[PDB]
Design a protein around this ligand. Structure first.
Ligand code: MG
Ligand code: MG
Ligand code: MG
Ligand code: ZN
Ligand code: ZN
Ligand code: ZN
Lengths: 48, 193, 49, 193, 261, 185
RNA sequence: GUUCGCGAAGUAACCCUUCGUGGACAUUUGGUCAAUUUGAAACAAUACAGAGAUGAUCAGCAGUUCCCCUGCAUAAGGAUGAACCGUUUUACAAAGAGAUUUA
RNA sequence: GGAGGUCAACAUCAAGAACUGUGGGCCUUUGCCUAUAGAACUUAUAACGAACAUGGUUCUUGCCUUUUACCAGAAC
RNA sequence: GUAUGUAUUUAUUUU
């Protein structure tokens, strides 16, 4: 249907960003894949 | 929009809070337009919101410097006189109105009352003849083809005999001291030092 | 249900609090879920009587 | 509208813009009801406009006279160190009062000279310039101050709200991160877990 | 046809008479921003309408019709609309065909041009929920007969049937004597909504009977959406309905699908 | 920025048939009806002369997961309600597939962000007493049938069709799952 | 409605008026928004009490939280703002001793 | 075509005592040297305004229970 | 002498 996208000039007194607000979210930490943690109790617990 | 209770104003209601940021501007743009002692009734250009949100007087006063020191020398003198003359001169009480008294709108009360004349001043038909014609106009010349530029009112262009008469009038209001050598330690630089 | 305090207050019973889809995986569970539902509908359906 | 939108219906602005509580206040309803150094500053500001333009409202009705007009709004611009009390909110503006006392005296003893002790007057210019400048000084500062106040009455205040170190709450910081920076080292001298 | 499709619709109330704004006296002072009253607490305000629509009497042809609007004037659905034939939003009972038009869009929004929310409301309140169709109305506070008990609950029945009957098509009306409610059910989500916004806050019987004079001080009958129905019967019935319906629409998906092959 | 950058997801039906169209872009529009967060709204009238202005009800994060036209709220591909499409796709296969969604508040807000899509998406008076009444068949169907061969009070509890009509002319022409009696006093 | 022009009729003597027609001039507003009960202010009143570190009476700063409130605020207050004060079992083994069962 | 507009948009306004274009020579585009043309506005008791305010950081003070709000000097 | 906190369901959701 084609298109042309024309922003709408405000009415400068009225809010700009009519829907903006200050809220709070917590967010999904989304991943598939893992980060293998890859490295390399007898005499020591004496010491420590 | 003075009466608002309805639903249909819940746009304009928000609109109002918006202009609350812009108001102080309007005050300034109102309060430098004061009609000044001599004018009777002043007419300005307001730019208004179309929600009834606020109304900015829109213009800025432009008055020629000498012509202006004239106009205020006139009123200055007429003052001193009209203080010396009359007997009990009663300063008015403040505030003008008590709090119970919502200010009465313009279209009804005030527009029929007619102005009750200002200062001006006697002047003359002999001394002041050049200047007596226009000197008290709201803005002295919105039009004089040759004398002033034109309606946009910038770059006034005058003539000796007039500018004389102005010199004459403004004599109360003028610095009067023509010898640079007068300010000796009163210049700036002796201040900064 | 005892009202709310802060306007966003959570009612924990209603929905999974923060639902982490456990993982992908190769082993294709997909059957064990039916043993689950059978046991869970079974349990709750018991308690009602 | 701003007020009734904070859900205070028990504060009343009369038509001179005094703010009075009409119902002696439950303490919580005081705390929710303290209002802003802005919104108070700006209340006062409007009060001044309405005061002057009142005196005009009178004159147009024909009730005073163009001389008592001039004296009146003179008296205003000088005694705003009484008629309003804007000096509670920005105290800086107490230069103008000092300034506008002084212009007062000058424009007298070059006026009184040889006539009268009385109230007669009517040179209000140099006041009017001073107050007009000082008003240009707070336009930006208001568009900011109240600009905030309104985005907070819509969008709710800021959710994060960090803060900074400061005079008082220093120690708790210094301590706090001291001990954290032991707990690294002592956590890493232990062999394992 | 000869009824609605024929003569132009009419005013009900003259804008003069239109109701008083500023809801009146729950409390001390009147808040300007919101429209409420300020302080104190008294029992909530609700009241019967002074008004109601008159299904075949006032409905008629209007402006949105000539120019082809969609949603139905709700201040007509209260018969309260003061604009007469001038009103853009349509005045009349939904036929089946208009629903023929809206039904494209009635997923999201009502017959009155309002945007259905998602979650219903604590009480099953006033505007729909797009996650679900519900055609079925709880009706409660039937005491908007005032308190005259009409010698049979089947006079309740005759009366609810008599009122809601007018608006259009109907499935069924199940009164409940155990607990006071009607539970009613219709064809078109359109019609459902329309009856709802119409019949809030009303009183009953003849152009007059008994306390008819004072009918105007009653509370008025709450009309709100209905939840599920716990019995087995109706429930199996439901999954049947859905079932046959999927059974139809598969034909669509094989038509466009099969064509796309 | 990126809010723009996933672009509108829009019906090819409800969008209307015309060749070229104009639609606004308003950067922070409504919140979703669903996730309850801001987004960019696109107005438009379908065609230019139209009476009503389409508005778009949801994110492009939210109308991704479900794959639904932000104005329509049908499926994109099948032109069908959620609670249908994932019902049909529940049928084939056998039992699965519903999307359990979001009461409370930041439950739904939170759950909006993760991109897993969702099950539907995953793939894509003369008293007349006439008895025998079938329970799930409505009045509309009954008096439907009557007006189709040519006013009512039914009781579905007792399966007893009670009935009245205006003139017994409709008595003859009525007669001239049905228990007949032409019953009046 | 203006203007240019044509034709016709009348007035006329190339015009004044009337009729018809051609041409030009002028070219798509507004809506995120319907008008009080059923798509959402918050206080107040009633009752129940009536201020952390302690044995007790107070100054206070912090810290965490999907709690915020007032304030222009990255200031400072809001009981040191409030909530915290609770419920608590498995990386689990090695050696020795007695009872039971069995190849 | 002329006059105007309390009309708009777009350029430009603090610097080697200061701008720009062009011809020619050299280096290798910059850059240097030479020749030439044109320069509105604003500048020497130095500047767009013979006018005159406010804010932030940083130090020095002054009121001095603490913070907003402040006292009076400087730098940015 | 007080801040502070708590509950304030009236209008019958299908067997
Ligand atoms: Mg604190
Ligand atoms: Mg304490
Ligand atoms: Mg604390
Ligand atoms: Zn209407
Ligand atoms: Zn669509
Ligand atoms: Zn969303």
């Amino acid at each position: 249907h084609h298109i042309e996208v024309v922003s709408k000039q405000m009415d400068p007194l009225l809010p700009r960003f009519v829907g903006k607000k200050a809220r709070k979210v917590v967010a999904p930490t989304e991943n598939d894949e893992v980060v293998p943690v890859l490295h390399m109790g007898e005499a020591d617990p004496n010491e420590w | 929009h003075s009466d608002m209770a309805s639903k249909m104003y819940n746009t304009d209601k928000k609109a109002f809070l918006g202009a609350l940021k812009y108001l102080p501007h309007a005050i300034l743009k109102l309060l430098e337009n004061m009609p000044h002692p001599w004018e009777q009734a002043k007419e300005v250009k307001v730019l208004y919101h179309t929600s009834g949100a606020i109304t900015f007087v829109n213009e800025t006063p432009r008055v020629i410097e000498p012509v202006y020191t004239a106009q205020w020398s006139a009123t200055w003198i007429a003052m001193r006189r009209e203080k010396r003359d009359r007997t009990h001169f009663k300063r008015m009480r403040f505030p003008p109105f008590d709090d119970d008294e919502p200010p009465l709108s313009y279209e009804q009360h005030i527009e029929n009352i007619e102005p009750l004349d200002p200062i001006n001043l006697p002047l003359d038909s002999q001394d002041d003849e050049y200047v007596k014609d226009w000197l008290y106009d709201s803005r002295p010349l919105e039009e004089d083809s040759k004398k002033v530029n034109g309606t946009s009112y910038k770059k006034w262009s005058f003539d000796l005999p007039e500018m004389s008469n102005l010199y004459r009038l403004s004599t109360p209001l003028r610095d009067e001291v023509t010898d640079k050598n007068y300010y000796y330690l009163f210049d700036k630089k002796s201040f900064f030092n | 249900k005892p009202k709310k305090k802060y306007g966003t207050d959570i009612d924990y019973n209603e929905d999974i609090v923060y639902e982490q889809a456990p993982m992908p995986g190769i082993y294709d569970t997909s059957t064990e879920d039916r043993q689950i539902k059978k046991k869970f509908e079974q349990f709750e359906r018991k308690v009602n009587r | 509208l701003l007020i009734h939108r904070k859900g205070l219906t028990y504060l009343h602005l009369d038509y001179n813009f005094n703010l009075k509580p009409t119902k002696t206040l439950t303490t919580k309803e005081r705390k929710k009801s303290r209002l802003g150094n802005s919104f108070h500053l700006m209340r006062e500001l409007l009060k001044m406009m309405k005061l002057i333009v009142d005196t005009h409202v009178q004159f147009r009705l024909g009730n005073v006279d163009a001389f008592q007009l001039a004296d009146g709004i003179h008296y205003i611009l000088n005694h705003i160190g009484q008629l309003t009390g804007i000096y509670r909110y920005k105290y800086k503006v107490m230069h103008q009062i000092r300034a506008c006392k002084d212009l007062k005296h000058i424009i007298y003893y070059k006026f009184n000279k040889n006539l009268g002790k009385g109230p007669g007057c009517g040179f209000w210019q140099p006041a009017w310039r001073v107050w007009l400048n000082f008003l240009r000084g707070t336009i930006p500062l208001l568009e900011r101050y109240i600009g905030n106040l309104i985005t907070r009455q819509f969008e709710g205040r800021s959710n994060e709200i960090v803060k900074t170190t400061t005079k008082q709450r220093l120690d708790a910081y210094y301590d706090l991160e001291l001990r954290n920076s032991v707990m690294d080292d002592i956590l890493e001298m232990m062999p394992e877990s | 046809m000869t009824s609605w499709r024929d003569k132009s619709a009419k005013v009900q109330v003259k804008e003069s008479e239109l109701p008083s704004s500023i809801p009146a006296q729950t409390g001390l002072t009147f808040n300007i921003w919101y429209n409420k009253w300020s302080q104190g607490f008294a029992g909530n305000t609700r009241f019967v309408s002074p008004f109601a629509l008159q299904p075949q009497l006032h409905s008629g042809k209007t402006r949105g019709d000539n120019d082809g609007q969609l949603f139905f004037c709700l201040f007509f659905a209260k018969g309260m609309c003061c604009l007469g034939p001038k009103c853009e939003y349509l005045h009349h009972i939904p036929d089946e065909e208009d629903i023929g038009k809206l039904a494209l869009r009635t997923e999201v929004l009502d017959c009155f041009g309002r945007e259905k929310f998602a979650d219903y409301r604590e009480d099953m309140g006033g505007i729909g929920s797009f996650r679900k169709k519900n055609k079925t109305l709880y009706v409660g506070g039937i005491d908007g007969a005032l308190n005259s008990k009409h010698l049979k609950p089947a006079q309740i029945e005759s009366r609810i049937r008599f009122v809601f009957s007018r608006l259009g098509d109907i499935d069924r009306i199940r009164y409940v004597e155990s607990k006071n409610c009607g539970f009613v059910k219709f064809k078109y989500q359109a019609n459902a909504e329309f009856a709802k916004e119409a019949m809030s806050n009303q009183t009953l019987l003849l152009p007059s009977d008994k306390e008819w004079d004072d009918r105007r001080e009653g509370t008025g009958l709450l009309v709100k959406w209905a939840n599920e129905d716990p019995d087995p019967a109706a429930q199996k019935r439901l999954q049947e309905e859905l079932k046959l319906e999927s059974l139809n629409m598969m034909v669509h998906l094989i038509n466009n699908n099969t064509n796309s092959a | 920025d990126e809010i723009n950058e996933p672009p509108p997801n829009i019906c090819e039906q409800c969008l209307g048939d015309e060749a070229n169209i104009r639609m606004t872009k308003i950067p922070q529009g409504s919140e979703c009806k669903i996730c309850t967060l801001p987004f960019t709204l696109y107005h438009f009238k379908t065609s230019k002369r139209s009476n009503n202005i389409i508005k778009t009800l949801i994110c492009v994060r939210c109308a991704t997961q479900r794959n639904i036209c932000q104005c329509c709220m049908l499926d994109s591909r099948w032109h069908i309600p959620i609670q249908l499409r994932d019902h049909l796709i529940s049928l084939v296969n056998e039992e699965n597939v519903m999307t359990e969604e979001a009461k409370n508040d930041m439950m739904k807000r939170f759950l909006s962000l993760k991109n897993v899509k969702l099950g539907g998406a995953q793939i894509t008076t003369k008293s007349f007493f006439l008895y025998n009444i079938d329970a799930s068949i409505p009045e509309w169907k009954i008096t439907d049938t009557v007006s189709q061969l040519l006013s009512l009070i039914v009781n579905h509890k007792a399966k007893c069709g009670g009935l009245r009509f205006q003139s017994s002319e409709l008595g003859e022409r009525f007669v001239s799952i049905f228990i007949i009696p032409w019953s009046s006093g």
